[PDB]
């Protein structure tokens, strides 16, 4: 029974734990070990994030949401990615109708982004 709890919802994105930064697609599966491990990464120099999450022994890659000035994945949108994560993580909501991934575990990387 010895691990941290979840948290950091109301923190900025720049003080998350799962926000690794600019990482390649291969590094994902080196970091994720548990079905439910996720991180958020940046693309190949595009201002566009990707959610990278291990499900059924396969590190899925979904571009982070963006509609307006929000992020929306199942239901409504939120002003921050980390705010949306919590309302997925505590609810176990499916990331897409096409793979039924749900958030469980957050790979820590520390707060020092790049």
UniProtKB/Swiss-Prot annotation:
Q: Describe the task this protein carries out.
A: Tyrosine-protein kinase that acts downstream of cell surface receptors and plays a role in the regulation of the actin cytoskeleton, microtubule assembly, cell attachment and cell spreading. Plays a role in FCER1 (high affinity immunoglobulin epsilon receptor)-mediated signaling in mast cells. Acts down-stream of the activated FCER1 receptor and the mast/stem cell growth factor receptor KIT. Plays a role in the regulation of mast cell degranulation. Plays a role in the regulation of cell differentiation and promotes neurite outgrowth in response to NGF signaling.
Q: What is the effect of changing residue 41 to M?
A: Abolishes pTyr binding. Abolishes association with microtubules. Abolishes autophosphorylation. Reduced kinase activity
Tissue specificity comment: Widely expressed. Detected in adult colon epithelium (at protein level). Expressed in melanocytes (at protein level).
Its name, as the record gives it, is Tyrosine-protein kinase Fes/Fps
The SH2 domain covers which part of the protein?
A: 18-107
The family classification in the record reads: Belongs to the protein kinase superfamily. Tyr protein kinase family. Fes/fps subfamily.
- Report the locations given in the UniProt record: Cytoplasm, Cytosol; Cytoplasm, Cytoskeleton; Cell membrane; Cytoplasmic vesicle
Q: Where is the signal peptide?
A: none
- Its gene is FES
PTM:
Phosphorylated by LYN in response to FCER1 activation. Phosphorylated by HCK.
Lineage at the top is: Eukaryota, Metazoa, Chordata, Craniata, Vertebrata
Q: How does it assemble?
A: Homooligomer. Interacts with BCR. Interacts (when activated, via coiled coil domain) with TRIM28. Interacts (via SH2 domain) with phosphorylated EZR, MS4A2/FCER1B and HCLS1/HS1. Interacts with phosphorylated KIT. Interacts with FLT3. Interacts (via F-BAR domain) with soluble tubulin. Interacts (via SH2 domain) with microtubules.
């Amino acid at each position: 029974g010895s691990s941290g709890s979840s948290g950091e919802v109301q923190k900025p994105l720049h003080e998350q734990l799962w926000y690794h930064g600019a990482i390649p697609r291969a590094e994902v599966a080196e970091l994720l070990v548990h079905s439910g491990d996720f991180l958020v990464r940046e693309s190949q120099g595009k201002q566009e994030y990707v959610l990278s999450v291990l499900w059924d022994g396969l590190p899925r890659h979904f571009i982070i949401q963006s509609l307006d000035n929000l992020y929306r994945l199942e239901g409504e949108g939120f002003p921050s990615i980390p705010l949306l994560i919590d309302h997925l993580l505590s609810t176990q909501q499916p990331l897409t109708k096409k793979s039924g991934v749900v958030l469980h575990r957050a790979v820590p990387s520390g707060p020092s982004s790049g």
